[PDB]
Amino acid sequence: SVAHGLAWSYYIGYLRLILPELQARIRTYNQHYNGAVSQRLYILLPLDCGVPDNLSMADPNIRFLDKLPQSNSIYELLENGQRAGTCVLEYATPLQTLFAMSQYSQAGFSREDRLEQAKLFCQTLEDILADAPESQNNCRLIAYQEPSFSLSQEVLRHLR
Amino acid sequence: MSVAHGLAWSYYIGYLRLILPELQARIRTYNQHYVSQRLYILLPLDCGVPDNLSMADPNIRFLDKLPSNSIYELLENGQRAGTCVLEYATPLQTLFAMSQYSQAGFSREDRLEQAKLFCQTLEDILADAPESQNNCRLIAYQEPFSLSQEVLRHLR
Numbered sequence: 001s002v003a004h005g006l007a008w009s010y011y012i013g014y015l016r017l018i019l020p021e022l023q024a025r026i027r028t029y030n031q032h033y034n035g036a037v038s039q040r041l042y043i044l045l046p047l048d049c050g051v052p053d054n055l056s057m058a059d060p061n062i063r064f065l066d067k068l069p070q071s072n073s074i075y076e077l078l079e080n081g082q083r084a085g086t087c088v089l090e091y092a093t094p095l096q097t098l099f100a101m102s103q104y105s106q107a108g109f110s111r112e113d114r115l116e117q118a119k120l121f122c123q124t125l126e127d128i129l130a131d132a133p134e135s136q137n138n139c140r141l142i143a144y145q146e147p148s149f150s151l152s153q154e155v156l157r158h159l160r
Numbered sequence: 161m162s163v164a165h166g167l168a169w170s171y172y173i174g175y176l177r178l179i180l181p182e183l184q185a186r187i188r189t190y191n192q193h194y195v196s197q198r199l200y201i202l203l204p205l206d207c208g209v210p211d212n213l214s215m216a217d218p219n220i221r222f223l224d225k226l227p228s229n230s231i232y233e234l235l236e237n238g239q240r241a242g243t244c245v246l247e248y249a250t251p252l253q254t255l256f257a258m259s260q261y262s263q264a265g266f267s268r269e270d271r272l273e274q275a276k277l278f279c280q281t282l283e284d285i286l287a288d289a290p291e292s293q294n295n296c297r298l299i300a301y302q303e304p305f306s307l308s309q310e311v312l313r314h315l316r
């Protein structure tokens with residue numbers, strides 16, 4: 001099960017390092033500018049493992065606002081043309097290993113196997129975050145399957 | 161639940177699969193401009209990856225960047241014994257960091273078992289990728305030591 005290794009590397013090599021300092025970085029950015037960024041990192045977990053080049057390409061209601069200094073991005077979520085939210089948002093990039101594996105014929109890794117590992121990656125990550133207090137309170141995982149679909153709506157639901 | 165299977169598949173599919181088919185042309189270009197046609201990957205079974213590769217041995221001196229891979233001159237008794245593209249298997253840093261994170265309940269004995277599994281799984285992956293296995297060499301080692309001598313043995 002490749003998902004156990006992917007979830008442990010994602011946490012130990014990245015989330016464990018950025019989440020304890022994210023609250024101070026968002027507080028600094030909010031103090032700098034008089035509009036306010038929500039205090040957590042929203043992680044997009046598309047269960048299809050499709051990670052685009054730019055997050056803004058997935059929905060025209062997700063506009064790039066700015067980079068959070070000290071590389072994370074802030075986005076404004078739109079609902080009917082109005083600014084419905086502002087947050088630090090990004091994809092769970094280790095999902096790209098599962099997508100690439102599903103296209104590499106020699107791996108013998110089907111789209112059914114890919115969905116099973118994408119789900120296992122999300123479950124293993126939430127098991128890891130359960131034991132890390134400063135990390136579970138500084139991030140929110142947004143797991144989704146596409147059925148017609150609005151990613152900004154999916155994010156907005158979690159924000160509220 | 162072994163982390164090594166995920167670490168070896170990501171190392172190959174997200175990095176080696178992309179750089180190894182174009183490495184032979186990059187080394188031939190560099191040689192024409194101004195050696196050794198393979199990527200030598202250091203796999204310390206202790207999972208210790210230093211900040212700079214040159215800190216692990218004074219007989220491993222940085223030569224240049226391959227137009228990010230590094231070229232190094234290996235020394236034996238002060239003389240240039242070899243020139244190759246060398247780098248560590250960076251996913252081993254997950255295993256080392258896991259072994260220092262209390263909540264993981266991942267011992268140094270568990271870490272050695274996963275470092276070995278990572279090399280075995282990566283060799284199994286490279287066996288099925290022809291253009292990748294011909295353009296890369298895995299140097300797995302346990303420190304009891306000369307890293308330059310360990311690399312030089314594989315070069316020959």
Ligand SMILES: CC(C)(C)c1ccc(N2C(=O)c3ccccc3[C@H](C(=O)O)[C@H]2c2ccc3c(c2)OCCO3)cc1Cl
Pocket residue numbers: 006009010092093094095096097098100170171172173174175176250251
């Ligand atoms: C080719 C594409 C589609 C563009 C792609 C892009 C990124 C990834 N990665 C992952 O899945 C990943 C899985 C676990 C931990 C960290 C990561 C990285 C990440 O999350 O960015 C990254 C990655 C993989 C291997 C590496 C590496 C970085 O650094 C050098 C050594 O080997 C994979 C693919 Cl397939």
Ligand SMILES: CC(C)(C)c1ccc(N2C(=O)c3ccccc3[C@H](C(=O)O)[C@H]2c2ccc3c(c2)OCCO3)cc1Cl
Pocket residue numbers: 009010011012013014015093094167170171249250251252253254255257
């Ligand atoms: C803190 C230190 C000691 C400095 C550290 C440094 C590097 C790693 N990585 C790995 O072990 C690794 C494992 C499998 C595939 C790719 C990699 C990367 C690599 O090989 O460089 C890298 C990594 C991990 C997670 C990531 C990521 C990159 O990109 C963003 C999303 O999550 C781990 C640690 Cl613990």
